[PDB]
Every structure is written in structure tokens, then in C-alpha cells.
Amino acid sequence: SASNATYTVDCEDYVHVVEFNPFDSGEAGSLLAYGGISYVVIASCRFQEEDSTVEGIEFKTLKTFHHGERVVAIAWSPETRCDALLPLLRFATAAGDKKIRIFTSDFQDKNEYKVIEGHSGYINDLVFCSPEGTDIASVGDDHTCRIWDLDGKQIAMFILRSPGMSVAWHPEGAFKLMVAEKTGTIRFYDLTTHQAILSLESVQVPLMSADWCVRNTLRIGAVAGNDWIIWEMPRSSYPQDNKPAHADRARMFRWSKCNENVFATTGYPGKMKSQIAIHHLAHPQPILIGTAPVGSGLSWHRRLPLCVVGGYRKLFFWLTEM
Amino acid sequence: YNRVLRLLEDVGLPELVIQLATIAIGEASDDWRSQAALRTRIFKHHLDMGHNNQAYDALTQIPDPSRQLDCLRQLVVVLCERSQLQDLVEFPYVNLHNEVVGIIESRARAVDLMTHNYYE
Amino acid sequence: LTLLLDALPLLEQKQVIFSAEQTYELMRCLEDRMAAKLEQDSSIDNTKVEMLRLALARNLARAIVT
Amino acid sequence: LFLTEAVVGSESFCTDEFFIRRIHKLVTDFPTLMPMKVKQLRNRAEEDARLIQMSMQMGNEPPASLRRDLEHLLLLIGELYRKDPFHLELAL
């Protein structure tokens, strides 16, 4: 049974990637960056569950950034804040031109961007690989993982054996970076000694996405082929749990930021509507199965049990009842 | 390109269908028939998604007059059902104001009085 | 007539006040008044009538719409 | 704040001379034995107040997280030495 989106927000163009702000900005609302065909819109999302005063969802676009290229991945910066005294809006966006654009703003007039070049292959995923927000890691189809600072200089380059699909920073432990290669070999790289700490293996191929669990650092989740896969460390490289997620192909894996048992997997934009299957570790079947016409981009709300999938000119929010 | 278009139709990705259809229009530079087919497909998908203005533009671009007229009828019917009559009013009529009048007239003289809102 | 003039800007306002049926009742009153009347001002009242009708019809459309 | 409102708030505190003497001993042992910390905190509070007030004067309102411990301290001094039943002139 298809679940209707709890909240649906109309947009100006197809959303290619939607990302909530996982860091505290100092404001009541949770920031949302959705990147479309030629733009990156920063918005603020206040929900009914967060505040009773809000009826439904209070969606307010704060700042629109002209990108010029299709945004394929967005990474929020730890320094992002909406403090009245000192506002800072920093985020890194990769595009379909193998380039990283760091947009630094103050929410008032000042708008600065920096093109970082170097990748010879399309960047699939990028994240800020620093607690202070100084470094940005980007993985791509050139079989390389490159660490870039704020000034656009490569600090380190890790040669992968497969196109890097998803890069993720360790929630608590410092200097640990997870790179998920497309052949299923997810590796952990030290950012101090620049050496591969460990290499996990997925039973199925291709590994399309991987995410850490903020609540439980040990639990690592990923989507290889049609089945979702969970690993738990320091135990084994073998999948602990492996159950079918989608019939066609599973594309994006995102852990819940409020619960260590809930995770969402999005189906691949293809013959079927891009379905979302919010699974639960205890329940064999997904707790919520919703359908989005064409959906790309998945992110979880920092405090609420809510996820977002960017559909065609729309934003679909699904609330998972805990 | 048409093969991929049929794929994307069953695939249910309307936007991809539209852009690829535009690229295919370019390849069929001299073939009015193929141009008309693809433009008709574009109009259809736009109408299905609620993109009234884009649908109307695609309609005004179809080289074949018969296809254009049938598409016009379909658009009129759909807008009536969705109660988007304001846009219908805004859309000008290519000497087919009377045609629209006649379509609705026939619908009325053919439907039960206590059920439909065509008359209104 | 004064009550009808007041009803006029009420119809005119962007947010429709009178429903379709209410405007039809006003029409009936106007027609009944016209009959009884028989048994400048005129120009303004005819313009009033026309605007009234236009607004009522637009509201009726919006109702048939809604 | 506790001292100012609950200890001196008692009208029977005006009685015993040794209560006032011990309290004054604590109050003057604070900036005599550890004045470095006191100065650090005075400068910190002054600067925080200035920054946050001046930034708010632009268009904003003062945040709820403000703690004017210096104002409470000055009020405490005023309230401690306000009353004189023992003719000590302890303010010397």
C-alpha cells in the first residue's frame, strides 16, 4: 500500500538532491538544501511536531544560489549557523562538471563561491571530512578519493580500485573516513596516517550507497544491488543483516538521526515510480512504503522521525511513527 | 530515441520523456510527421502533470492540424474536470472558439441534466 | 435602491461575498422592483445592474468550478 | 542572589555583629585570595554584554541566555553594606 506523503512542498524545478542540516544552526527551524537543475535553494523547515504553533509545515526559502549545473550531491558544513550576531551559511556542492562549489554566505548580500577542480570523473558523493569544517572529501568515477581544504588544495588522494559511490565521515571517532566503492568494498581511511584501516565486503554488487549510524557508531548500513545490508563492528566484515529492500534496484541508504533501528532506502528512478521503503531492524517488512513519481535525494531530520525525498517539483516528507 | 521514449513512458519518468522527445524533434528536422508525433506526446505528458501553460505551448507547435485539434479537445476536457477554467479562459482560441462552444454544446445535449456540470 | 448600491461593491470586492443563489435572489428583487416601478440615476443604476451581473456570473463560474 | 535575597532578607540578620563580620570576611577574602579569577570573569562578562547588546541593537532582541552576575554582585554589595545597626562603618 502506497503511503501518501505527510507533507508535500511545491518547488520551482525537479529536485536532484535534498539534504537536511545535521548540525545545530541556532535557529528553531531545520535547514534544508535542495539542489535542482541549475540552482541550490536553502530553506527553513518548521514542523507541527516540532512546534504546535506551526500548522503542517512552515517552509521558508531563505536564500537561492544560482549553480548553473545539475547539483548531484550536497554537503553541509559544521560552521553553518543562523545566529543573529554572526550568521554563516557554508556548504559544498558537487555537480555534473566534476567540480566542487563551496558557497559561503552571511544570509545578507555577501555571496561567495569557489570552484575546486581536479576530478577527472563525475563526483558521486561529497562530505565535510573535518569536525571544524575545514576539509571536504569527494569520491568519484575516476577511482579516486580526494581530500580538499577550503582554499581548493588537495591534501591527500586515495587511489580506489572501483568508482567511489558514497563517502561518509565517522560520527564520533576522529580521522576516520568511510569510502564505499562500487564493487562492494567499503574501506575506512585514516586522515592522519593516510592509510587504509579496514576493508568491509558486501555480498551483492553494486554498492550504491553507504551511511554511518549517528546513534550507534558501530552500525554501518548500505545498499548493494536490490538488498539492504547492515554491518556491525568490531565484529566481522560479513553482513549481519541482509534483506531485500526494493524490487528493481536500491539506490540511497540513509540512517535515522533519532533512532538506531530505523533506516530508509530509495528505489531507483526507473520503470516504476521511485519508491521509498522505510525499513525497521526488528520488522522484516518496511514500516512505511511510499511512492514518489521521480525521486532523487534522501535525508533524515536531525531530531524528528521524518525523512525527505525530492520528487518532481515537489518535496515529499514522510513521518515514521516510532 | 523513440524506443527510449517508449521505455521512459512505461518507466513513468515524464520529465525524461519530455527532454528526450525534444532531442528527437531535432533529429527529425524535415519529417513533419515525426515532429507532430513527438510534440503531441510532450503535450500529453504536460497535461497529465498539470503543466497547463507548457501543454498549451506544445499544442500551438504541432504541425498537423488534426492532431492539434484533438489535443485541444483533450485539454479542454481535462481542464473542466480539474476546474481550472481560469487558464482555459486565458488560453486564446485559434478560430476555434466556436469549436469549443460546439464541443460543450454537444456534451450537454448528450448527458443527463442532474449529473453533469457541462451546461454550467 | 440604496441597499442594492451597497450590495454592488460587496460583489465587486476581490473576495466574493454574496453566493450565487443570493445574487440570484437580488436579481429577482431588482426585476420585481422594475415591474412595480412601472406600475443620471437611471444610467448609474443600469451600470450598477451590469456590473452586478458580471460579478454574479464570475462567482457562479467559480462555484460551478468549486 | 541567594545571599542577597535569603540571608540578608532576614530581618534578624540585622542583629548579630558576628554574622556581618563573617560575611564581610568572606566578601573581602574573595578579591584578596583569588583576584585573578575575579578579574578574568569581570572582563569576560563586560565583553560578552557589550558584544551581544551591540549586535542586537541593529535589529534583534537580547538572547535569553544572559547572566549578569556582575549586576547581582554589585547589588549584593549595596545590600550588604546598606544597613548600619552596629556603627561599624565597615565600609572603610
Q: Using omega within 30 degrees of 0 as the cis cutoff, is the peptide bond preceding A206 cis?
A: yes
| CA separation, residue A218 to residues A103, A199, A264, B30 (Å) | 32, 14, 18, 62
On whether any CB of chain A is under 8 Å from the CB of B4, the answer is no
Distances (CA, A) of B90 to A60, A62, A99, B20, B84: 30, 33, 44, 29, 11
Contacts of A100 (CB under 8 A, 6+ apart): A92, A93, A94, A115, A116, A123, A126, A136, A138, A148
| Alpha carbon distances (Å) from D63 to A23, A83, D60 | 20, 10, 9
Q: Reading across the β-sheet that carries A154-159, which strands appear in turn? A: A123-127, A135-140, A144-149, A154-159
Kindly state the helix (H) or strand (E) to which residue A103 belongs, with its residue range. strand A100-105
Chains near A (3 or more Cβ pairs under 8 Å):
B, D
Which residues face A168 on adjacent strands? A178
Q: Is D49 on the interface with A (CB under 8 A)?
A: no
Interface of B with C (CB under 8 A): 83, 85, 117, 120
The distance of A273 to chain B (nearest Cα, Å) reads 6
**Residue C4, number of CB atoms within 10 A of its CB:** 15
Distance from chain centroid for Cα A125: 8
If you ran DSSP here, which 8-state letter would residue C14 be given? S
* Distance, CA of A320 to CA of A262 (rounded, Å): 9
Chains A and C touch (3+ CB pairs under 8 A): no
Distance in Å, alpha carbon of A295 to nearest chain B alpha carbon:
10
CA angle A93, A32, D56 (to 5 degrees): 105
B15: nearest CA in chain A? A312
Alpha-carbon span A99 to A80, nearest angstrom = 21
Nearest CA in chain A to B10: A271
Q: What's the reported resolution, in angstroms, to a tenth?
A: 3.7
Please report residues of D whose CB lies closer than 8 A to that of A86. Answer: 55
> Are A23 and A72 in contact, with CB atoms under 8 Å apart?
no
- Nearest chain B CA: its distance from A270 CA (Å): 5
How close, in Å, is residue A248 to chain B by CA atoms?
Answer: 11
C61 vs B83: CB contact, 8 Å cut-off? no
Q: CB–CB of A84 and D51 under 8 A?
A: no
C34 touching B (Cβ < 8 Å): no
Backbone angles phi, psi at D75, to 5 degrees: -60, -40
Gap from A107 CA to chain D (nearest CA, Å):
14
| Residue B15 grid coordinates | 520529465
Which contiguous run of DSSP H or E holds residue A288?
Answer: strand A288-292
**Which chain A residues are within 8 Å of B10, Cβ to Cβ?**
271
Q: What's the Rg (C-alpha) of chain B?
A: 16
CA B17, B19, B24 angle in degrees (round to 5)?
90
Are residues A84 and D55, on separate chains, in Cβ contact within 8 Å?
yes
C-alpha cell at C17: 461575498
Q: In chain A, what residues touch D56 (CB-CB under 8 Å)?
A: 84-85
In terms of CA atoms, which chain B residue is nearest residue A268?
A: B11
Quote the radius of gyration of chain A (alpha carbons, Å): 18
Q: Of D87, D76, D85, nearest to D24 (Cα)?
A: D76
Q: From CA B15, how far away is CA B12, in angstroms rounded?
A: 9
Q: Which residues of A touch D63 (CB under 8 A)?
A: 84
Q: How far is B71 from chain A (nearest CA, A)?
A: 24
Q: Chains that contact D by 3+ CB pairs under 8 Å?
A: A
A271 with B49: Cβ contact below 8 A = no
Q: Give B120's contacts in chain C (Cβ within 8 Å).
A: 60-61, 64
d(CA D43, CA D37): 10
- Best B79, B104, B120 member to test C by mutation, with max C CBs in 10 Å, is B120
- Which is nearest to A96 in space by CA: A121, A113, A116, A77? A121
Task: Suggest the residue from A13, A273, A294 to mutate for an interface test with chain B (most B CBs closer than 10 A).
Answer: A294
Show the cell assigned to A66: 544560482
**How far does D25 lie from chain A, in Å, by closest CA?**
41
State whether residue B14 sits within 8 Å of chain A by CB: yes
Residue type, A41: V
- How far from A259 is each of A216, A222, A280, A301, A302, CA to CA, in Å? 9, 16, 10, 11, 10
How many C-beta atoms lie closer than 10 Å to residue D28's C-beta? 11
Q: Give the C-alpha separation, A95 to A125, whole Å.
A: 10
Chain B residues close to A273, C-beta within 8 Å:
12
